[PDB]
Design an enzyme around this catalytic site. Structure first.
Site, short mmCIF file in Angstrom:
data_model
loop_
_atom_site.label_atom_id
_atom_site.label_comp_id
_atom_site.label_asym_id
_atom_site.label_seq_id
_atom_site.Cartn_x
_atom_site.Cartn_y
_atom_site.Cartn_z
N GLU A 35 0.82 -1.21 0.00
CA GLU A 35 0.00 0.00 0.00
C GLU A 35 0.86 1.26 0.00
OE1 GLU A 35 -3.06 0.47 -0.47
OE2 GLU A 35 -3.97 -1.50 -0.20
N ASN A 46 -7.60 9.48 -5.60
CA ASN A 46 -8.40 8.58 -6.41
C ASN A 46 -9.34 9.37 -7.32
OD1 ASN A 46 -8.53 6.94 -3.36
ND2 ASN A 46 -7.43 6.07 -5.10
N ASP A 48 -12.44 9.28 -7.71
CA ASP A 48 -13.65 9.82 -7.08
C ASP A 48 -13.38 11.06 -6.21
OD1 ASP A 48 -12.48 8.84 -4.75
OD2 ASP A 48 -14.10 7.46 -4.27
N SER A 50 -11.49 11.23 -3.51
CA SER A 50 -10.98 10.87 -2.20
C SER A 50 -9.47 10.67 -2.27
CB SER A 50 -11.66 9.60 -1.69
OG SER A 50 -11.34 8.48 -2.50
N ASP A 52 -6.12 8.50 -0.28
CA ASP A 52 -5.66 7.45 0.63
C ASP A 52 -4.46 7.94 1.42
OD1 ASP A 52 -7.61 5.77 -0.48
OD2 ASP A 52 -6.21 4.99 -1.97
N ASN A 59 -8.79 5.44 3.40
CA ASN A 59 -9.47 6.29 2.43
C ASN A 59 -10.33 7.36 3.09
OD1 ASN A 59 -12.08 6.70 0.51
ND2 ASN A 59 -10.20 6.46 -0.69
N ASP A 101 -15.27 -4.38 9.56
CA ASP A 101 -16.45 -3.82 8.90
C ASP A 101 -17.18 -4.82 8.01
OD1 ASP A 101 -18.03 -1.35 8.56
OD2 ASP A 101 -17.40 -1.51 6.46
C1 LIG Z 1 -8.27 0.74 3.43
C2 LIG Z 1 -9.41 1.51 2.84
O1 LIG Z 1 -9.66 2.66 3.18
N1 LIG Z 1 -10.13 0.86 1.92
C3 LIG Z 1 -11.28 1.44 1.24
C4 LIG Z 1 -12.49 0.51 1.38
O2 LIG Z 1 -12.95 0.56 2.73
C5 LIG Z 1 -13.63 0.90 0.44
O3 LIG Z 1 -14.48 -0.23 0.26
C6 LIG Z 1 -15.81 -0.02 0.71
O4 LIG Z 1 -15.85 0.24 2.10
C7 LIG Z 1 -17.16 0.34 2.68
C8 LIG Z 1 -16.96 0.63 4.15
O5 LIG Z 1 -16.40 -0.50 4.81
C9 LIG Z 1 -17.95 -0.94 2.43
O6 LIG Z 1 -19.29 -0.81 2.92
C10 LIG Z 1 -19.59 -1.87 3.84
O7 LIG Z 1 -20.10 -3.06 3.20
C11 LIG Z 1 -20.43 -4.13 4.10
C12 LIG Z 1 -20.96 -5.26 3.25
O8 LIG Z 1 -20.53 -5.16 1.91
C13 LIG Z 1 -21.43 -3.68 5.17
O9 LIG Z 1 -21.56 -4.71 6.14
C14 LIG Z 1 -20.97 -2.39 5.85
O10 LIG Z 1 -22.01 -1.91 6.70
C15 LIG Z 1 -20.63 -1.33 4.81
N2 LIG Z 1 -20.18 -0.10 5.44
C16 LIG Z 1 -20.96 0.97 5.59
C17 LIG Z 1 -22.37 0.85 5.08
O11 LIG Z 1 -20.55 2.00 6.12
C18 LIG Z 1 -17.98 -1.26 0.94
O12 LIG Z 1 -18.63 -2.50 0.71
C19 LIG Z 1 -16.56 -1.31 0.40
N3 LIG Z 1 -16.52 -1.65 -1.02
C20 LIG Z 1 -17.39 -1.25 -1.97
C21 LIG Z 1 -17.11 -1.75 -3.36
O13 LIG Z 1 -18.36 -0.53 -1.73
C22 LIG Z 1 -13.13 1.25 -0.96
C23 LIG Z 1 -14.20 1.84 -1.85
O14 LIG Z 1 -14.43 3.21 -1.53
O15 LIG Z 1 -12.07 2.21 -0.88
C24 LIG Z 1 -10.95 1.69 -0.23
O16 LIG Z 1 -9.89 2.57 -0.33
#
Ligand SMILES: CC(=O)N[C@@H]1[C@@H](O)[C@H](O[C@@H]2O[C@H](CO)[C@@H](O[C@@H]3O[C@H](CO)[C@@H](O)[C@H](O)[C@H]3NC(C)=O)[C@H](O)[C@H]2NC(C)=O)[C@@H](CO)O[C@H]1O
Ligand SMILES: [Cl-]
Ligand SMILES: [Cl-]
Ligand code: NA
Length: 129
Positions: A35, A46, A48, A50, A52, A59, A101
């Site tokens: 990373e 990124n 979008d 945002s 990192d 993020n 999460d």
């Molecule tokens: C290291 C880092 O910052 N990585 C980032 C990722 O965290 C992010 O992926 C998305 O993150 C969110 C938050 O965890 C995910 O939402 C969660 O999804 C699960 C089930 O899928 C749910 O149980 C949680 O409640 C939900 N969180 C909420 C609603 O707050 C999400 O699924 C991840 N991926 C996608 C494709 O949405 C990515 C994308 O922004 O960025 C990384 O940098």
């Protein structure tokens, strides 16, 4: 600060990451290597809008506030600049929230693509832990 491999492993172990949510220490060191190349000051923007931040490239859309990612959550309740410190405490505390999460360490794209399913124990070999 640019950590050494074993230096970071030791710091992560001290902060409770070894086997946190079932992920052995080598997973965390592998993810930090790819990373950020062990650099606490790493940032990457990124598409979008945002950014990192730090050793684990946390993020700004979800986890920290950098004042320029509109419509972002601040789930770790920290400014993103706190994640660039030579002290990894803030990054580790936030990472523990991320990995709990639901998607585990798959939240880190580099871990998914470069660490998952590999012999991650190699990342802590030779370290006095
Ligand atoms: C290291 C880092 O910052 N990585 C980032 C990722 O965290 C992010 O992926 C998305 O993150 C969110 C938050 O965890 C995910 O939402 C969660 O999804 C699960 C089930 O899928 C749910 O149980 C949680 O409640 C939900 N969180 C909420 C609603 O707050 C999400 O699924 C991840 N991926 C996608 C494709 O949405 C990515 C994308 O922004 O960025 C990384 O940098
Ligand atoms: Cl281990
Ligand atoms: Cl998991
Ligand atoms: Na945010």
């Amino acid at each position: 600060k640019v950590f050494g491999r074993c230096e970071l492993a030791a710091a992560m172990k001290r902060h409770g990451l070894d086997n946190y949510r079932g992920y052995s220490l080598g997973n965390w060191v592998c993810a930090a290597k790819f990373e950020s190349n062990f650099n606490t000051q790493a940032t990457n923007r990124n598409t979008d809008g945002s950014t990192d931040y730090g050793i684990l490239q946390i993020n700004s859309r979800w986890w920290c506030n950098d004042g320029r990612t509109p419509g972002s959550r601040n789930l770790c309740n920290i400014p993103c600049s706190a994640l660039l410190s030579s002290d990894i405490t803030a990054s580790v505390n936030c990472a523990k929230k991320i990995v709990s999460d639901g998607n585990g360490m798959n939240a880190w794209v580099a871990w998914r693509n470069r660490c998952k399913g590999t012999d991650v124990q190699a990342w802590i070999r030779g370290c006095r832990l």
